[PDB]
Design a protein around this ligand. Structure first.
Ligand code: CL
Ligand code: CL
Ligand code: CL
Length: 280
């Protein structure tokens, strides 16, 4: 209830922008030297969103280990997430190499490939069973096995094959397809349904590698997902759920990737999701 009382006060006083800017002022700042090397320019979608050196995911490849992706290790929640930008036309092989190397079971996608004409990520998985994809640079094959299309999101069963060894893995693609072109969803019900479905699938089990979460830059909608999921985990784990301080959780996550939650509306939406999910 305390988080809800705080929410009602913030709404009443109109202080979402002030709270959000306090977060930005306190956020950690660590170097991103590798992301800024000239040879990595075309591996970054946005010049102002980079992974920190200390938490970036390294590809196991001799020529260039760089991908714009960060390991968010929430120690108290005992859950790890990989937050990444939506893959570029030239980094789709890198993306699936990362999924393979990190042993991830689930991919969470929070955008449409094109929004208001802007390409927010490449078409990095097959839309049709009969047109599988081959990533020649990383020697991976990806096939659509089936998909379950719902009103607010789609879940896909993908088969990822390492063509070198012929080993195959099932990857679940959790695609929230209806986040609005501008702003945040009016209600968090569909987002929470989605978040619970990811958790119910087993993809977050400590038996697998970290779930991979992405949007356009990997910080705004992805930040909302990680923040809400961590907060709901903590409420389920701790003895006093009213003890969960969403701003503190968000500052902890920002130690691992810059810029998580990109507007005061996304912050308010994260509060709504956590308050409503806490009630479940
Ligand atoms: Cl260079
Ligand atoms: Cl986005
Ligand atoms: Cl920011």
């Amino acid at each position: 209830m305390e988080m809800e009382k705080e929410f009602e006060q913030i709404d009443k006083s109109g202080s979402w922008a002030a709270i959000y800017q306090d977060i930005r002022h306190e956020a950690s700042d660590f170097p991103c030297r590798v992301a800024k090397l000239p040879k990595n320019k075309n591996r970054n979608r946005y010049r102002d969103v980079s992974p920190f050196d200390h938490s970036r995911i390294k590809l196991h490849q001799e020529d260039n280990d760089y991908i714009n992706a960060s390991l968010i290790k929430m120690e108290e929640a005992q859950r790890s997430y990989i937050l990444t930008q939506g893959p570029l036309p030239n980094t789709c092989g890198h993306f699936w190499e990362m999924v393979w190397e990190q042993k991830s079971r689930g991919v969470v996608m929070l955008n449409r490939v094109m929004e208001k004409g802007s390409l927010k990520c490449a078409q990095y998985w097959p839309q049709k069973e009969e047109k599988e994809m081959i990533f020649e640079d990383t020697n991976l094959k990806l096939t659509l096995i089936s998909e379950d299309i719902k009103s607010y999101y789609t879940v896909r069963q993908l088969e990822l094959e390492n063509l070198t060894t012929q080993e195959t893995r099932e990857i679940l693609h959790f695609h929230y397809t209806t986040w609005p072109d501008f702003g945040v969803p009016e209600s968090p019900a569909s987002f929470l349904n989605f978040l619970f479905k990811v958790n119910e699938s087993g993809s977050l089990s400590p038996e697998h590698g970290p779930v991979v979460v992405h949007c356009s830059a990997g910080i705004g909608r992805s930040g909302t997902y990680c923040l809400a999921d961590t907060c709901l985990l903590l409420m389920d784990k701790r003895k006093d759920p009213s003890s969960v301080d969403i701003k503190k959780v968000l500052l902890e996550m920002r130690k691992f990737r810059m810029g998580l939650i990109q507007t005061a509306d996304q912050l308010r939406f994260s509060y709504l999701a956590v308050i409503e999910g806490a009630k479940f």
